[PDB]
Amino acid sequence: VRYEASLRQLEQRQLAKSVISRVQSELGNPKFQEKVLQQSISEIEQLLSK
Amino acid sequence: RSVLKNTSVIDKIESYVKQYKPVKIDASKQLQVIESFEKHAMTNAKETESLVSKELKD
Amino acid sequence: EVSSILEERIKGVSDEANLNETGRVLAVGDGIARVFGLNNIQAEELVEFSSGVKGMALNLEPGQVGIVLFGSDRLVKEGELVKRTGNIVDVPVGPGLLGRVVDALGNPIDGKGPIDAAGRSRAQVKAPGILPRRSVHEPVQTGLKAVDALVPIGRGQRELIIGDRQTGKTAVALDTILNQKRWNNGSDESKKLYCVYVAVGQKRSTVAQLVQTLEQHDAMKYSIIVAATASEAAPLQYLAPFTAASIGEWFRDNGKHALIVYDDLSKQAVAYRQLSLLLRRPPGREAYPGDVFYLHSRLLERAAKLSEKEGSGSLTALPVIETQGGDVSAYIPTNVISITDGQIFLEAELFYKGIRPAINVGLSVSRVGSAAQVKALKQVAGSLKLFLAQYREVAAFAQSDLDASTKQTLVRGERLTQLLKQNQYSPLATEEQVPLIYAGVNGHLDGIELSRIGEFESSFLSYLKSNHNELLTEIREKGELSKELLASLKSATESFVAT
Numbered sequence: 001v002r003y004e005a006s007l008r009q010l011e012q013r014q015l016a017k018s019v020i021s022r023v024q025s026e027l028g029n030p031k032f033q034e035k036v037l038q039q040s041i042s043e044i045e046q047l048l049s050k
Numbered sequence: 051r052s053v054l055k056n057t058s059v060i061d062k063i064e065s066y067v068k069q070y071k072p073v074k075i076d077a078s079k080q081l082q083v084i085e086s087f088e089k090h091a092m093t094n095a096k097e098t099e100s101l102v103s104k105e106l107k108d
Numbered sequence: 109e110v111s112s113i114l115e116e117r118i119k120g121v122s123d124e125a126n127l128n129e130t131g132r133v134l135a136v137g138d139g140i141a142r143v144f145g146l147n148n149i150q151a152e153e154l155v156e157f158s159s160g161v162k163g164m165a166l167n168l169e170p171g172q173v174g175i176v177l178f179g180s181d182r183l184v185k186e187g188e189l190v191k192r193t194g195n196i197v198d199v200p201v202g203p204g205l206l207g208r209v210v211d212a213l214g215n216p217i218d219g220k221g222p223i224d225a226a227g228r229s230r231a232q233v234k235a236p237g238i239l240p241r242r243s244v245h246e247p248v249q250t251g252l253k254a255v256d257a258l259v260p261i262g263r264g265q266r267e268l269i270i271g272d273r274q275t276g277k278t279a280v281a282l283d284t285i286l287n288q289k290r291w292n293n294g295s296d297e298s299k300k301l302y303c304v305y306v307a308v309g310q311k312r313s314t315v316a317q318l319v320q321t322l323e324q325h326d327a328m329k330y331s332i333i334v335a336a337t338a339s340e341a342a343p344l345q346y347l348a349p350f351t352a353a354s355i356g357e358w359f360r361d362n363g364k365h366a367l368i369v370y371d372d373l374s375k376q377a378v379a380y381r382q383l384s385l386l387l388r389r390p391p392g393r394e395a396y397p398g399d400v401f402y403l404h405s406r407l408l409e410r411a412a413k414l415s416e417k418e419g420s421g422s423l424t425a426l427p428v429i430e431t432q433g434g435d436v437s438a439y440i441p442t443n444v445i446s447i448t449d450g451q452i453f454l455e456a457e458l459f460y461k462g463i464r465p466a467i468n469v470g471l472s473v474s475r476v477g478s479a480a481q482v483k484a485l486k487q488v489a490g491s492l493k494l495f496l497a498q499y500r501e502v503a504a505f506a507q508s509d510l511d512a513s514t515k516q517t518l519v520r521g522e523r524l525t526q527l528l529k530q531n532q533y534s535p536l537a538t539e540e541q542v543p544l545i546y547a548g549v550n551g552h553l554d555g556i557e558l559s560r561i562g563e564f565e566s567s568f569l570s571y572l573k574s575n576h577n578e579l580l581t582e583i584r585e586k587g588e589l590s591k592e593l594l595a596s597l598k599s600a601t602e603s604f605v606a607t
Binding site: 001004 | 053054055056
Binding site: 011 | 125
């Protein structure tokens with residue numbers, strides 16, 4: 001049981017560093033450009049609701 | 051067992067435990083030594099008893 | 109799966125709305141960010157930095173708002189957005205915090221999952237007044253024979269555990285928590301003190317010991333450990349008793365009983381000192397902040413035995429103060445001593461002389477005291493107070509040609525002192541306190557050899573349990589010793605002494 005829990009923590013940390021790799025991939029994409037538009041229109045909706 | 055998610059060893063040690071379940075078998079070894087002991091003891095006990103009872107009435 | 113839990117967590121993030129007031133740090137040094145912005149800030153409001161650090165706003169200055177970082181300075185940096193959480197310091201309070209080791213924020217530092225709580229209540233809530241209280245009339249037994257008899261402990265009342273450094277001060281306290289298990293097991297809400305131990309400035313190693321001992325004695329199921337460890341920063345350390353008090357207030361508000369042990373306010377003092385000095389607020393006596401009296405007084409007045417209009421409840425408290433060289437003279441001790449209502453003064457010499465608990469009877473006082481003593485226990489221990497008093501006076505006479513009267517005092521006194529030794533972390537039920545003390549009072553223990561006192565004690569108890577646990581059950585349930593019981597008890601002691 002002890003090693004099973006330890007292994008779960010280790011898996012989570014393996015996937016944590018894999019998440020950093022995915023973040024770098026996302027910031028590579030021109031999704032980086034396209035999501036600025038997504039933020040823009042979403043903010044237009046938000047700010048108009050004010 | 052429902053704690054362990056790696057369970058394929060709980061079935062193993064369960065079966066090993068239930069296998070070796072008469073871990074140590076029955077013992078009554080005081081049945082030859084207790085009866086022999088009881089004979090010598092009884093003989094002496096009755097002798098003493100009769101002796102001191104006899105002396106009391108004397 | 110590890111994937112599924114992570115997937116739930118990512119899924120649980122989604123969108124936001126207008127950040128009401130941004131700030132930009134002007135300068136951050138010493139954990140004192142001085143922020144430009146936050147125009148409409150509420151006093152001591154919780155504010156969230158870009159780094160995610162949380163802060164309070166102790167100084168609201170005429171153009172800068174001096175946030176105090178709850179986090180480490182490393183993470184915060186100049187010009188940071190300082191979002192306004194917009195909620196003054198409040199902590200979840202409810203029933204679920206029982207058996208949850210939580211830090212000041214309420215985040216389980218033992219990972220016992222999201223807190224179940226019935227409210228989040230401010231930690232600056234002001235104490236109940238004059239008329240919202242009704243005088244103490246409910247004992248709290250600590251399972252320490254000396255504490256229960258020599259300095260009886262009530263409810264809603266406060267008494268110090270003021271004593272020399274690392275004399276296992278926490279041990280004296282922990283014993284009380286253990287004894288609460290017996291009463292806790294019962295179903296009556298009258299018989300339920302939900303203890304809260306407030307570990308202030310205590311090293312994580314210490315808290316590990318605390319956690320294990322409490323778990324070992326199954327205490328967690330009426331315990332809460334509010335933990336502000338040594339590492340945890342000076343805002344947390346400052347707000348740690350305040351936070352803890354709020355948790356207690358919820359129980360108190362429900363009209364239940366509970367015991368909150370602030371250990372130690374000496375480290376609380378240091379934290380306020382750190383905050384004030386770093387915020388450049390006027391310094392004061394013994395380099396403790398000018399308003400340190402005000403801080404301690406605020407905390408210690410929260411503890412209250414409520415009125416019947418407020419459906420009598422309590423929040424018994426036991427502050428712990430660590431004396432530096434035994435100096436009651438020292439500014440932080442003097443203040444606390446004045447504020448509290450009774451003191452228990454543990455003494456290092458006694459500890460060394462093997463008396464454990466090492467409570468120095470002379471320097472222990474209760475100003476509520478015998479008002480909340482068990483009636484049975486009161487009866488059988490008026491004598492005890494006087495005998496020990498005499499034993500103290502006749503103590504120095506222990507150097508030859510000694511009066512018969514003095515020698516009588518000495519025999520009785522030495523045996524009593526030996527009797528009041530107890531193995532720490534074993535509490536003793538009141539129904540077993542009452543017999544032992546009765547014997548001593550009737551001086552039948554005077555005859556018993558000093559070396560044999562320890563053996564005698566356990567034997568007397570087992571003998572009583574064998575001989576007549578009916579008497580014991582009567583003592584427990586009637587709680588008032590009838591003449592017939594006092595008769596029987598004397599007989600029983602005599603009979604036991606004979607064997």
